[PDB]
Amino acid sequence: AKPTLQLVYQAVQALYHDPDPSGKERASFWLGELQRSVHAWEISDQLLQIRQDVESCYFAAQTMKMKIQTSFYELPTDSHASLRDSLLTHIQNLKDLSPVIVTQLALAIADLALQMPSWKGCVQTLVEKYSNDVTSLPFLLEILTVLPEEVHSRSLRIGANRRTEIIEDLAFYSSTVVSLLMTCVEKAGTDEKMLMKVFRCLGSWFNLGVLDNNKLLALLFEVLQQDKTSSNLHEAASDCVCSALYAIENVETNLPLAMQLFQGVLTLETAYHMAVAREDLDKVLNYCRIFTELCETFLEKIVCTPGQGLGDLRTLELLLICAGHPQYEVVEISFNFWYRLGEHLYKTNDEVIHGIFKAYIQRLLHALARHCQLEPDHEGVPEETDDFGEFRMRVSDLVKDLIFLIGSMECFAQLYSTLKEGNPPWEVTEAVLFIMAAIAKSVDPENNPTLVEVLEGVVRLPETVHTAVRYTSIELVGEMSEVVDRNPQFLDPVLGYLMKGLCEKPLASAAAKAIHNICSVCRDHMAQHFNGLLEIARSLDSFLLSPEAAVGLLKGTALVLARLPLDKITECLSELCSVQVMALKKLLSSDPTVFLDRLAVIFRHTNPIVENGQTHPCQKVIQEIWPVLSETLNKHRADNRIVERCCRCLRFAVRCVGKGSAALLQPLVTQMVNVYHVHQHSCFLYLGSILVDEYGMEEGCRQGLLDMLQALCIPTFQLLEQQNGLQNHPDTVDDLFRLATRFIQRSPVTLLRSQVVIPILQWAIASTTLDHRDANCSVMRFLRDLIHTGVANDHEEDFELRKELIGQVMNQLGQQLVSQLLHTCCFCLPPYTLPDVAEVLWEIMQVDRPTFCRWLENSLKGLPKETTVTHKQLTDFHKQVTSAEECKQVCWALRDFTRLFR
Amino acid sequence: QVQFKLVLVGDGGTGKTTFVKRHLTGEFEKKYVATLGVEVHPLVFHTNRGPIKFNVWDTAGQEKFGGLRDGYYIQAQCAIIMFDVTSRVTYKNVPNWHRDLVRVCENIPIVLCGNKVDIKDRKVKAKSIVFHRKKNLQYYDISAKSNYNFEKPFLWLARKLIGDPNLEFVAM
Ligand SMILES: Nc1nc2c(ncn2[C@@H]2O[C@H](COP(=O)(O)OP(=O)(O)OP(=O)(O)O)[C@@H](O)[C@H]2O)c(=O)[nH]1
């Protein structure tokens, strides 16, 4: 059906001006299916004929463009001629209304031009028709600017080979376009908005350039050379130059052009210095972008032939001149080039080349070192999250990488030397310390006489010193944990310096990281200072930290704890968890997440080396901890997240203790099942999979675990049985099959002989269609292991049982599995599964190949071929797969076969 | 009330809806339900100068459910391009979205958001992005899962749009 126009206008108005989101969405849908139909040709045409506003026209033009590209095959041939003339008319009338409309119409014209062979003819005719008339040149250049861009467009609907033979034409029209542009500067040319269009068009055409030099480049650079040039035109020209340079890099490409662009860019140094002199930041940035493009374009020729042709080191010189600019955003650019250079130089093992580039790198690091300085006006610590902070982090990363091309020790030394003889203000000191912190761990140990002079120097600097300096110094101290470790006498002084700083708010976050590191490095030397670490645990909330920092402190504490005498680990751990326990008990009565996590980390990183007893030292804490977690879990049972963190805590605790939680087991399982029946929090299924990972081997647990599984499966299935139950709740799928896999891993027979294996298998088969990667990975892994258990561990006692059990579970649902898999591969999922599916199919074959052959045959019989796959592609697929002696073959076959259905 | 039109754009499954629906106070959506056309979501941000309002047009990323693709982009005052750091295919298509936006919105401020930086094996590294070399363009690593730098795109855009580089977010 076709609607009335004012209804369409109502819809457009509603879409663009209804404050209510719902209304906008309704309008979007309506206009959505107003397009997509057969009638919006006429409608959009009519909307273009009428001109009530910009929006209707924009929507109309956009619809037209969209329609000639989303539905060109509904178009009767002989009529096409009338469309071109229409778009040419509309764009002739809506010229000076709004450029977006002109743009959409330009897109339409181009897209139509590309996919209709009115041989050729469009470019030369468009030009020959609209060239002389100047008032038409702006939209003419638009079209020509968008024609090469729409070749590699997403929305376009054309063969693969067609693009290659289309690209061959534009390369033909190149010269003519260049002539047009060279003619476009003759007429007009004294108008910036014209030259900008010329440069845009020129820029978007460089990927097809084969030859030609001529005046356009000279003009392009002349514009960049002149000081009078405005910011906009400067940007246009800059982008054009960059586009040329980038267009070159892939192809060799043509050195006569590269030379010209090279010298061209080289002439811009004076203009750059002018731009810097007048403090015109835009132009400086643009120039730096041009120089950076130049350098990155000719990198290989710079490194392979330093100082020859395109290897002229004046490029690096320009980049270093840019590096010398006070502004950070300027030198923020070109970091990628230096990264690439450093990379290539790391690959290379040549003394002379390293010798050659080392100087430039040193100069770079000097500049970047100067750059990390704050303002003397600055007060308080330097925030890590601020833009300048981000810059400083990027600098830290870059310099952290590059220092291998110099002496890490050397750089560190001469960096420290700066503080000794200045003596500098706090900004410089802070910057140097900041850079030193980023290099410290890379320094040679036996250079410790300097290090200890720095450490000892930055441990006893007074409190009155600027807080930023102390902050950065704390970070540095944190980064010298190895130095502290190799010189034990420094441990007690250092800690005292960090703990102090822990009590001052604005430093607390830093000290927390330093102590963490040390605790992790001087793990054995910290046994004496443990009581101090516990007090830090009791007082964690007094130091206003980020959660991560506190968690870090506790992590360190745990790592240290795990190395104390076995007879004290229990005591210490008890008094350690006591904190979180009391904190949690207090909260009733409010989010308990923090303390849950704090427990989790303690249990996570407390892995004491114990030659198994029984009993495990950490088994006297889960007792004291369980009731609290149980209560917490019972209270916030509705909050998935909190339940998740609680289950995570429990998970780490179980994996920490090991098999020594058989007493903790049944209450936990009961509460799991009890709560899960109300709130299907998938984390319960995951947790469940961990217990199986610990107790699946133990007879006497198997039954209880099976009961748990069967209990959990019912509400799960009920959850997935709902509408879009798989699309929603993919984590349920993932964790369900995680649990199932762990069952199959630790206890195959128990599951294989239960009544839930079949419905789980059915849900797997059903879940194969789900477009979700973790879930799918889990499902396919489960299928693989499940089928594999029937041909695994022959030496083992239960093999025969397992073998025939799988045989039974294959007698049914086998055909179904194969067919579903084939359908899924062909129609549902993208290729990333084909390996996983292949691993399944490969397992089915090794269980019973001759039946699999017929299963696959039947699957292929019931496969829709149309929308056409031929014989000898089905046959070759079936043969390739069934005759495979490795999963890789099955995978390749699946790829070859899958590609046919696109 | 002071408000802006923000067009949220990016390949399918990159985490646009999750992002927006994370900002709208809620859990972390694990499900992937593809957007149909556009979903408009109002996001209010309190600042030292008062509350700003971003009308976020969360557009579809999949070609099959795109709807009025460019049709949404008009009148837009800013934009977020998002991709998946664990999928170079989504990063490869950034300049296409960029060009799509530019063709409708001359040179509005735009932020590129590298989502899912919590997942291991990062295929698209931060030190590789050269998208934000220009002045009006920015880049950010973000995590819709861990709320990492989740407010930053809006703060940057807000700063650019209002014209105050010292603008701050408050609560609430
Ligand atoms: N690990 C991780 N996963 C994420 C993150 N963000 C999104 N995801 C996952 O990726 C999926 C993305 O879903 P959506 O946000 O709806 O995808 P979209 O960007 O809206 O794309 P459209 O199909 O165009 O709507 C979700 O199902 C999440 O499970 C993230 O920050 N970290």
Ligand SMILES: [Mg+2]
């Ligand atoms: Mg979405």
